[PDB]
């Protein structure tokens, strides 16, 4: 690995610099290197890993959506033939997106999840597994689409089961998981009613637990609750 000769602590420090610089591909490469040292990640380090890859895949998802839209219009009646280039370039971006998702899934499988025993780490990694299978599902069109969807579902469900047993309903990881699983239901699984029910239940259970929280925790939780509400508004 290109990062094999760099100290763990140096990789972490450079990931933080890359974040400040908005160099997210570098940030991801540093954090991959840090994971590949083989030690478990701290809470802060897990967050750095997530931020890095979320930003990398987010640029790719935004690009893919623009290209897919252009390709779809090219396939309408009365659209002039322009050759293979739009499909080719959409495919290029898609393949790179798939490669990033595969990289993340590979880190989780080798060996982040298997060593994650505390709820906070295990749920966070299983949520990430669901997320990156969801990003794969957003572009999937072939024979394995059902299996990709199934993999996302399974990871999210495992995470949900742990989070309900082990975390308060206000925990930001639990909230963000439920938020993303609701988006999966709505956008991927053709289950808008399930999406809406999960968002409602999650929001209400969190509301009932806010009284237990410090001011700072309250802010963290209410931030994610607001996203649940925003989606409910969009969906109902």
């Amino acid at each position: 690995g290109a990062m094999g000769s760099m100290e763990r602590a140096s990789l972490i420090q450079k990931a933080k610099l890359a974040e400040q610089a908005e160099r997210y591909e570098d940030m991801a490469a540093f954090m991959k290197g840090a994971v590949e040292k083989g030690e478990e990640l701290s809470c802060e380090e897990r967050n750095l890993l997530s931020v890095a890859y979320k930003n990398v895949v987010g640029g790719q998802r935004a690009a893919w959506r623009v290209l897919s839209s252009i390709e779809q219009k090219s396939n309408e009646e009365g659209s002039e033939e322009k050759g293979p280039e739009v499909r080719e370039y959409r495919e290029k971006v898609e393949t790179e997106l798939q490669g990033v998702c595969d990289t993340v899934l590979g880190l989780l499988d080798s060996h982040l999840i298997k060593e994650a025993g505390d709820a906070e780490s295990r749920v966070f990694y299983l949520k990430m597994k669901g997320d990156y299978y969801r990003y794969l599902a957003e572009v999937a069109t072939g024979d394995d689409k059902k299996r990709i969807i199934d993999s996302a579902r399974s990871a999210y469900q495992e995470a949900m089961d742990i989070s309900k047993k082990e975390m308060p309903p206000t925990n930001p990881i639990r909230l963000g998981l439920a938020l993303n699983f609701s988006v999966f239901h709505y956008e991927i699984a053709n289950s808008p009613e399930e999406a809406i029910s999960l968002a409602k239940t999650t929001f209400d259970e969190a509301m009932a637990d806010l009284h237990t929280l410090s001011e700072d925790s309250y802010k963290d939780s209410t931030l994610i609750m607001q996203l649940l509400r925003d989606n409910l508004t969009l969906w109902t």
Binding site: C43, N47, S50, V51, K54, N55, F124, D131, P172, I173, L175, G176, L177, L179, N180, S182, V183, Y186, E187, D220, L223, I224, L227, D230, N231, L234, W235
Partner: peptide
């Protein structure tokens, strides 16, 4: 179109 979670959670 929907909002998904921020990357950083604690």
């Amino acid at each position: 179109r929907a909002h998904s979670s921020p990357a950083s959670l604690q």
